[PDB]
Amino acid sequence: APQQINDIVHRTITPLIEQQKIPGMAVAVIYQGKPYYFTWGYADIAKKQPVTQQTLFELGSVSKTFTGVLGGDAIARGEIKLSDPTTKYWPELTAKQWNGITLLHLATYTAGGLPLQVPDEVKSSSDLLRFYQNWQPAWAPGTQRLYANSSIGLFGALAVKPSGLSFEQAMQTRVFQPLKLNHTWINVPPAEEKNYAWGYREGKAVHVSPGALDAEAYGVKSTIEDMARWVQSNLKPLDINEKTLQQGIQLAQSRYWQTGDMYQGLGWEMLDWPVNPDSIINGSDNKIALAARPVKAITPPTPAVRASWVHKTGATGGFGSYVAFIPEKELGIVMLANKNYPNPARVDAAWQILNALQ
Ligand SMILES: *[B]([O])([O])C1=[C][C]=[C]C([N])=[C]1
């Protein structure tokens, strides 16, 4: 890499790893469209396996960006509309509180208080139906945002129903394959296990547990190379040859709702660039990010704004991920770690790197 990118990344990430006791980390910077890669530490402490550019990390909720783009692609295919009622795709959802709750509300966490987590107790398809039928909204639809797996997870499951494909097959064929993300997985195959890092939580090696709507809300694993490619694809969707995918990526960066200075996309979240770094840094802390906040509808949604900081944090029990990019500057970053360390530290490091390069 150019020495500037080298120095800027190492000066930022080295102290981060030290302060946060991160066992292993991979970083990609996309600069003028090209990726530059950096790795540190251990994918597996016990077996002394280093982090490489081929190490798989759990993306946790950065998976929501793939779900949002897959949904956008389904809209572009004419398979679903965000204006469709949820019941159009799940007619068994007959309880009256669902009247007026559309796919847009599910995709954007604005259905009226669907919870962060699907209860552990919910396994089966019928457990799931039961859960949503019994769920009681605290708020009218389209009035409050509450970040929630049970919201965007259901959006992803419903979005692929007209295709007839499983969520995983739709994701593989319509997003991973066309983008050449050939080392990105909802279920890690046995052949790729050698590359699957352990996560570390309180010093114990852990991997994400199965759960309902896991694939759709937080279940993607990927490498630093495929994630750089994901960022490049979202930075420059016009280079993408598959028309509906290009369009889906654009739709996922449309601005649907505003709360404070952030705008809710499909999976992606966006702020105007130049950002106030305290705003994105403090904003990423779960004290704010997981809070219930009133929203203003953007009527109609603003199409993808090039001058945006577009980003998403993700975590599982053992992993902490972050992706951010600025379309107008052809600039982006991916930070993958196998410890779930605090969000504000991620965003601070990212902003320090990108601000120094823009
Ligand atoms: B995501 O990483 O923000 C997330 C939120 C809640 C639960 C899970 N598994 C992921």
Swiss-Prot record:
Effect on the protein of changing residue 64 to R: Lowers activity more than 2000-fold
Active site (UniProt): 61
Biological process terms in GO annotation: antibiotic catabolic process; response to antibiotic
GO molecular function, one term: beta-lactamase activity
Regulation of protein activity: Inhibited by the beta-lactamase-blocking agents avibactam, enmetazobactam, relebactam, nacubactam, vaborbactam, taniborbactam, zidebactam, and beta-lactam-analog boronic acids, via a covalent binding to Ser-61. Inhibited by non-beta-lactam, benzo(b)thiophene-2-boronic acid (BZBTH2B) and various cyclic boronates. Not inhibited by clavulanic acid. Inhibited by O-aryloxycarbonyl hydroxamates, via cross-linking of the active site Ser-61 to Lys-312. Weakly inhibited by citric acid.
Subcellular location per the Swiss-Prot or TrEMBL entry: Periplasm
An annotated GO cellular component: outer membrane-bounded periplasmic space
Chief subcellular location: periplasm
Known EC number: 3.5.2.6
Alphabetical UniProt keywords: Antibiotic resistance, Hydrolase, Periplasm, Signal
NCBIfam families for the chain: bla_class_C (NF033085), BlaEC (NF000185), CMY2-MIR-ACT-EC (NF012173)
Protein name: Beta-lactamase
